[PDB]
Design a binder for this molecule. Structure first.
Ligand SMILES: COC(=O)c1cccs1
Lengths: 377, 372, 365, 374
């Protein structure tokens, strides 16, 4: 038996040929089309919507969505493998894809009416329509202030969502808002379309990380939403969480792609650098640590993927892998950065935003601590 | 929605074959039933109890991978892993005693020995009737064999040998003419002395000593015929390191469990300690590392059973398990206020320091071609 | 232009001639009398009160206490140099000392009466009387006015020196509820001090409890010039200052042991070198901090929050260095279990981070 | 009696009255003139040559250079305090200063002829002439003897100031019976200095190449009093001392920004400052800066009194930069959002410090402890 330094536990052999082909298709697309764009896309914060069509056309948008609705009807491991190949190039591109698949197609497929599913899903699956997802607000992460008023014909929406990836270029908007409906105040999901009166999506520029992805606001001022546009089959925490859980899973796989790019570059760098550097034992220890955390992270997300597919995965498990992948990836980017004398620095600032996106209070540690102790911090 | 198991998030239990689950439960019932009530006083007073070898041999826990042909239970590598984890869950010293019999003594005889050696030594080693030790370390190896009528004559010293003062069987590595060879010696071989060493800081539950050799006659039927060079010792060490990778995770789990129960019990400014945000971070870290470390040694086990595992993978897992376990023992120790965990901690400081950072450098060479 | 690996910033050169001999005095004592004792003392948790006699003999007890009361009349830099030389051998030893100096002789000197100071200090200085400090409980311990005198009742826990102490400085509450200081003496009825055995760290020091079952305390035994929080706190702040110097001595043993180890077989290893450099750096920087704190304490320019910086840093870094040294080996182990206790003695909630966080922000955690 | 959270060991009071004045002048300048420039200068990688004359006119260039040659004749502590007030704004600005001081003025003063020192130093001191330091390559750069002097052929990479420099201190190998230092001037035939743009860190400083193609150097342009390693090393040792102070200015900025952030920000009803972990991090930042400052101070004094070995600058540079980078990362990870607010001045300090920490010392201390090279 021979050693594969780049795949010590032979993940490649733990996958079905099925999943390998999906991985290889995602790799071919990301390396062929995204890598030639990424440097100046990031450097100059370009808007590049053409990516939704490209991924849609080869069946990599909404991977778990059934063929009935235009999806490629794949499993969670394949979704994972796709995220990882996209983020290997850049987290901003993976972000764009996460939104479409997990934050837009999922809640529509899961909670929407037949009419909503057939109207929206097929066009989201091809990338003809671009989605975004409105949950997070100007600042307090349930405690949401965006509000729907029952009016003749449907609903009137007022509030503001902030840091919404895809929002300046989106055709479809999934927005979460409190509806006080006699005499109970619950969170409901609403579909809005581009050009809806009272709906704005201003762009945010001068971002520090995720510069390759166009991000903006969702500003709602008495924006009318017809009855047929409320998500009928969900209320409360279940709506937003189903989406977030799907997205966190993809990010857990994706951040390991980013970690792997940093690791490969660091390794190649020390192989090429005469001073060679590879003979240094502090350098060797760093490479051993990178290889280790990635190899173990990959076994975790693979096992989680398999459990999700078999229906045995509790939601708390996602907190372990997302938190671990993002944290370990950031550690690896910092370690690789500190070893260099372009790509790494990009992944590094991307990962700094990703690690802090869901707050600076370590939400996943708290989900896990509560799961262990019973007690909320 | 599916149920979360905080103590087994990836449902390791469900990834085990039923065979493997039963081996685990058998080791668990033994270690919790026989070793746990002994451990506190044994560690405090460095009391030897070799009764463990006979006890473990009875339930077929020694030489787990050795075929039934030779008295062994004929289990797979995953089962070996599970046993070490259940034993180290109590104490690393008890696990060391077992690592030695299984990986350092029965493995070399089975892998490199003659039919005669295997039929003679393995069955009593498997039942724990004979106790084995592994003579490699020395106080670029000094110990030498020399050819004489009927056999060989050995002279030299081995130091820090676990099991040696109580061993019946000795697997000794000496240079012959210039290659390292393995020799099987018995207690009551003229020329062999095995004095004890006392007052260790860690692994106090096990007994360790020397092997002093002086014209010790080893008959012809007693040289290991099927190995020469670094392959002999390294094969044993590779086997032992695999069991230690699982074992350090059992010790890590105990520390995690103790720390979790501790913060559930103790109170701080009105709330239980478990309510603190910092405490939960630590519990989350302990849970994460244990859960991921387990998936690693399980995959390594599966690969060894299918013959797809290279030797470098063992380095990843042993270094990771021992390093993470040590981090968790320290985290747990630092979470306690006053003056089990302290014992696990000093044990894991010896385990981690034993072989420096040879594994990071093995992994470094495997990535880069260059040896440092 | 000549480099000292063991003293990169030449602390020696920053010390007064007076201070430099006191350090070498505590060093000659610690290495001469304490080093040959420590291994077996720690091993069996043996009691040896001879150390109080010996340190007293040579003026290392209550070192800031004025010559008028039996003290050597030294300053804070000198006090720290002593703690550091003593802890360099063992933390348990330093603990016994810093109880005498900071937790017994300081509160008596600072808050005592003329008669109390004349009676207790001179004998505490020579080590003839051994003191202990009674603050920590399993605060509930109350003073009840009599007759006398006062009638104290309660229990103190983890009291170093107590099973062999002659003098007990006990802090209890009294209403007119304010915390007051009390002096008690061995033989006192209702007072008892049973030992505590089977410790993990600090085995070389003796520790016990203070059980007060309506112990009678004459009015000539209460501390007049102290009430409330600033009592215990003045003592603790004094001890914390000494521990900040001490932890660094223990850190230095571990570094020196570790450096010697890699020389005797390893020193070419770049991982090792990084580790030895980290030890060198943190100790070197730690010393500049405690020295500067000392100079400031002697000039009156030192605020109390500064003791939180240096104590937290010394202890935390010493523990890191002891663990770094241990993981390099194949004395350190004893310093390690000691430092593990020392880092958590004041709790596990990082009291000094919270003190400093508040000083920076004006907001309590 | 009173705690000073921003200066717990009152470093202020450990300074001579002379050193304090110099610090206040560096502060007033950097805050007055550099703070308003930085955000846009860093964003667009803007070139402002004018800063050298500004720094020159207040005697911030070549602080240790004697008054005889236009220097302000200050001590090492003062040089340190200057670098710290400048890097408090931005490492890119400090990088310009330390190149002029330690990498251009120092080799000429230390190793140059008397005619070189009086030709070059007074103009370098006023900022009339801008200098650069040609050591790093993509050593191969070669000086060869020709009638009248030397011909230089070679190529230097990542040379800060090079595209705007009037004076080039170029280290090249010359064969005599070894590394030699040469002085070149702007406009020399066979000398070009193309700029590098698109940098990740240190964007506020201009950096470029030195390309030498048979560049003729007069005989009186070779540095007469240095051969081999000690030349480039002495400059770098000087620069390293300045970097050790500057890095702590940067760290102090990230610390201050993080502290104000948690003051202005609320989370779950309470201000962020009330969070235990936040307080720990702020205690760590305060601790490492305070101790870092005591270290660089003591090093300066030793350098002034002439008792510091080269090894001590290694420990101080490594520590300052390594701790400054930890503090920047600690501050960064405390901030929510993505670039728009003031607090993301921390992101700027961070990419700067990632380059500074990269621009060996642990192996110096290891070998100095042990006598064994690794
Ligand atoms: C893709 O952007 C998001 O909404 C995220 C959700 C969780 C991490 S990032």
């Amino acid at each position: 038996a021979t050693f594969h330094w780049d795949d010590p536990l032979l993940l490649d052999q733990q996958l079905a040929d099925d999943e390998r082909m999906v991985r290889d298709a995602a790799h071919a697309y990301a390396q062929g089309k995204l890598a030639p764009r990424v440097t100046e896309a990031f450097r100059h914060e370009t808007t590049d919507a053409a990516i939704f069509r490209e991924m849609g056309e080869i069946g990599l948008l909404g991977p778990t969505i059934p063929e009935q609705y235009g999806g490629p009807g794949l499993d969670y491991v394949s979704y994972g493998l796709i995220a990882r190949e996209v983020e290997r190039v850049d987290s901003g591109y993976r972000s764009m894809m996460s939104v479409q698949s997990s934050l837009v197609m999922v809640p529509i497929f899961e909670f929407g009416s037949d009419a909503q599913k057939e109207k929206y899903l097929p066009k989201l699956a091809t990338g003809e329509w671009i989605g975004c997802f409105g949950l997070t607000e100007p600042n307090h992460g349930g405690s949401m202030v965006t509000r729907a008023r029952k009016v003749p014909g449907g609903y009137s929406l007022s509030g503001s969502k902030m840091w919404i990836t895809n929002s300046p270029i989106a055709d479809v908007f999934v927005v979460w808002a409190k509806l006080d409906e006699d005499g109970r105040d619950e969170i409901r999901g609403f579909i809005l379309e581009k050009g809806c009166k009272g709906l704005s999506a201003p762009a945010i520029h001068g971002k520090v990380g995720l510069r390759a992805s166009i991000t903006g606001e969702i500003v709602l001022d008495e924006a009318f939403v017809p009855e047929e546009n409320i998500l009928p089959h969900v209320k409360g925490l279940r709506g937003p969480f189903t989406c977030l859980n799907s997205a966190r899973y993809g990010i857990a796989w994706g951040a390991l792609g980013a970690a792997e790019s940093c690791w490969h570059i660091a390794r190649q760098y020390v192989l090429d650098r005469k001073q060679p550097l590879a003979a240094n034992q502090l350098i060797q220890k760093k490479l051993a640590d990178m290889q280790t955390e990635i190899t173990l992270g990959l076994q975790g997300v693979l096992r989680l993927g398999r459990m999700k597919d078999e229906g045995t995965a509790a939601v708390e498990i996602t907190s372990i892998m997302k938190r671990n992948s993002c944290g370990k990836a950031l550690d690896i980017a910092r370690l690789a950065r500190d070893m260099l004398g372009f790509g790494v620095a990009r992944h590094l600032v991307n990962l700094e935003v990703v690690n802090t996106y869901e707050g600076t209070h370590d939400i996943h540690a708290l989900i896990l601590g509560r799961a262990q102790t019973g007690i909320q911090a």
